[PDB]
């Protein structure tokens, strides 16, 4: 009976919550109470990157911690040099409606996608000296919210069709499709070891996935609205989520439950982008109120605020060496903070 | 200068890239962006046919004016996540079928098709991302509405309607009902045009509406407001 199946699902959900409540012997706040507070963190805008003529929707950092790519609705995907504010490349796009961009770890490729539901892979290093479309990945039935590179041949894409995918670039086919989200997936974050990745969707749920098998090991709940940004802790045993309910939450995979929430009464707007510092102590979240607040991971205290963007900060990124963090905003500007 | 030879050449490449970006941005600013919306088989395809995946982009030039029309009828996702990408469009072309009053929606008979069109219009007109964007309202299927209004009355869609079965009164009532959905009447203005399959002046109506929008925008820019 369908009612019997629903009752069984409810019983399994009660078992899950009972087990999680059993594992909650002591919260993060009590354990990290004695830690010396981080203190106020003031970060000046070292570089401002100008040249975008529309809202900046995406931004990613190369592995070298110097070259970054930026995506905007002007139809262009600019690779910047952070140290010297030079434009290494400017890539025209067939579709100007882009929402995400990626930088390959090898740095040879850059991926871009958006409302066309196509992940376009761009070959930066070519004999002809120009950036060219290498592969147009098709198959999704909704807007691409985020794409991240595993290596030169594998890429993970999250779409508005409630399905994440892992592509094999050489053949342009879907190696495995991830299903289980009721709402549209809005962000994904690969583990540093690259065998798992977290997907945050509009169902207020974040799900762990195994890239090789295709099953969802854990599903995380607690948010009251759409999760816009997700990010892995540097360890890979934890991740943070940014939602529209103006709260950021830190989950751990092994304990399978949330640890604590990053919320303030003054903050009403939803978190658009989230990021972590190299040590994981600082949680940088880009808010819709033209601000980017830096939090403390182990204590709910807010260390500092990075102001300087006229419009909504749409993307965030901390370098691999952790020295600089970039805030891209709808006001057509990029800023490097240190 | 304290710059190497290749450093200077890299800066020169950056300046050339900046020049190309400036020219492309000026070209884009010269262009007119229209967002095309409709509910079901409202005639959106027909009006696309007259003028000339997720987004179907159509470009055309009419009277030295370059037109971008974006169609998002195939997205089938949460509209609030991607509706802010279209903030800044010159005008929103809303397509509504007049014959939908008699027909009921495919999914369940509880909801009438025209009521779903009204709900979409209320969500789009009153959205916070489109507070200053004018709307071009295309009411299609005039021949179908003429044929239907004789056989079936407008009271089925509108029980409060107490008027003649003639085309003019019913069309005026439908247009007035759609125009009342504009809460911010001061910020925007809605242009309504009655079109059919054989109509050939829809492009002219769109051109006039965009001309008015450009006039108002540059009045605001010039300080006259």
């Amino acid at each position, epitope marked *: 009976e369908l009612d019997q199946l629903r009752q069984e699902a409810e019983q399994l959900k009660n078992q899950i919550r009972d087990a999680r409540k059993a594992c909650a012997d002591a919260t993060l706040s009590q354990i990290t109470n004695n830690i010396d507070p981080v203190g106020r963190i003031q970060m000046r805008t070292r570089r401002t990157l100008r040249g975008h003529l529309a809202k900046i929707y995406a931004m990613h950092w190369g592995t070298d911690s110097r070259l970054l790519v930026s995506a905007s609705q002007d139809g262009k995907l600019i690779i910047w040099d952070s140290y010297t504010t*030079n434009k290494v490349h400017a890539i025209p796009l067939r579709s100007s409606w882009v929402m995400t961009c990626a930088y390959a770890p090898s740095g040879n490729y850059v991926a871009c996608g958006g409302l066309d539901n196509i992940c376009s892979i761009y070959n930066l290093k070519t*004999r002809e*000296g120009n950036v060219r479309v290498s592969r147009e990945l098709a198959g999704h039935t909704g807007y691409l919210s985020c794409c991240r590179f595993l290596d030169d041949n594998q890429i993970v894409t999250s779409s508005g069709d409630t399905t994440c995918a892992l592509w094999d670039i050489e053949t342009g086919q879907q190696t495995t499709t991830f299903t289980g989200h009721t709402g549209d997936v809005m962000s994904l974050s690969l583990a540093p070891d690259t065998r798992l990745f977290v997907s945050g969707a509009c169902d207020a749920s974040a799900k762990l996935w195994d890239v090789r098998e295709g099953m969802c090991r854990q599903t995380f709940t607690g948010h009251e609205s759409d999760i816009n940004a997700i990010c892995f802790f540097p360890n890979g045993n934890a991740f943070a989520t940014g939602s529209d309910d103006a709260t950021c939450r830190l989950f751990d995979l092994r304990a399978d439950q949330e640890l604590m929430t990053y919320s303030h009464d003054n903050i009403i707007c939803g978190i658009t982008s989230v990021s972590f510092s190299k040590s994981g102590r600082l949680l940088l979240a880009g808010y819709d109120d033209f601000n980017c607040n830096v939090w403390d991971a182990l204590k709910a205290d807010r260390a500092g605020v990075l102001a300087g963007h006229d419009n909504r900060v749409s993307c965030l990124g901390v370098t691999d060496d952790g020295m600089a963090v970039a805030t891209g905003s709808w006001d057509s500007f990029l800023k490097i903070w240190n | 200068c304290t710059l190497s030879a*290749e450093d200077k050449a*890299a800066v*020169e490449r950056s300046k*050339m890239i900046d020049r190309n970006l400036r020219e492309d941005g000026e070209k884009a600013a010269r262009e007119v962006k229209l967002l095309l919306l409709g509910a079901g088989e409202s005639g959106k395809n027909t009006i696309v046919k007259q003028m000339k995946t997720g987004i179907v982009e159509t470009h055309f030039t009419f009277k030295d004016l370059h037109f971008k029309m974006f169609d998002v009828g195939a997205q089938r996702s949460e509209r609030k996540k991607w509706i802010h990408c279209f903030e800044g469009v010159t005008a929103i072309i809303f397509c509504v079928a007049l014959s939908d009053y008699d027909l009921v929606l495919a999914e369940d008979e509880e909801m009438n098709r025209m009521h779903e069109s009204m709900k979409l219009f209320d969500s789009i007109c009153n959205n916070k991302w489109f507070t200053d964007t004018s709307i071009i309202l295309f009411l299609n299927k005039k021949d179908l509405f003429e044929e239907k209004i004789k056989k079936s009355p407008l009271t089925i869609c509108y029980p409060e309607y107490a008027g003649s079965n003639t085309y003019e009164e019913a069309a005026a009532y439908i247009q007035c009902q759609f125009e009342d959905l504009n809460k911010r009447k001061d910020t925007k203005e809605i242009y309504t045009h009655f079109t059919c399959s054989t109509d050939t002046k829809n492009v002219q109506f769109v051109f006039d509406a965009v001309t008015d929008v450009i006039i108002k925008n540059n009045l605001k820019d010039c300080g006259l407001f």
Partner: single-chain antibody
Amino acid sequence: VQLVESGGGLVQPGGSRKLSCSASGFAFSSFGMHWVRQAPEKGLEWVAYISSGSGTIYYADTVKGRFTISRDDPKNTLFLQMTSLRSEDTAMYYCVRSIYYYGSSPFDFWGQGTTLTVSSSDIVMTQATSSVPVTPGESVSISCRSSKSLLHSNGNTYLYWFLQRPGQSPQLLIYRMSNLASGVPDRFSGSGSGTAFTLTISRLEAEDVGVYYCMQHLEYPLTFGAGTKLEL
């Protein structure tokens, strides 16, 4: 990618000729372009350089005034107009492409060469040996020296290595003293202390015979080395 060069021919002293380099297979507008001269029995010497968009143009002191370099982007060709020729210019002329961004590989591709026959504070690079016997399968180190330090404040040391096989145009081996060029076998490697630099080949095949030149890019009067010849 190809750079076919036309021109040359017998020229009387004091005459004038035009050299045309035709580009096919790459974005000509993006690449900065150079002209390099190789004497019939001597090494390479820089002549002129034109940047992307013709923004900046630099000549050597020898050909300053007499020579002018211009490019035609729409027709994908590069022009070198020579006037007041002398017996100092009788040589083979090379048309070399160079692109300049972060991580780029300048002097990547070289043209075949066209022969011009005339009838009858700059950094100094020294490669002392100029000829060394070698055995296949062994390891060889080639040394070059610079009058001034090639290390800039940005941390980039601008030294370039080129291989000129017998009857073949120069091919880039190492750019900026450590980075292997695209397609060059991994056996080659480079190292240096900022004033003196070495190029090391772990193993030698029959393809490695040729003359190796050390070039500098710190200041635009680019001076090539005399060259070291490896013969078995």
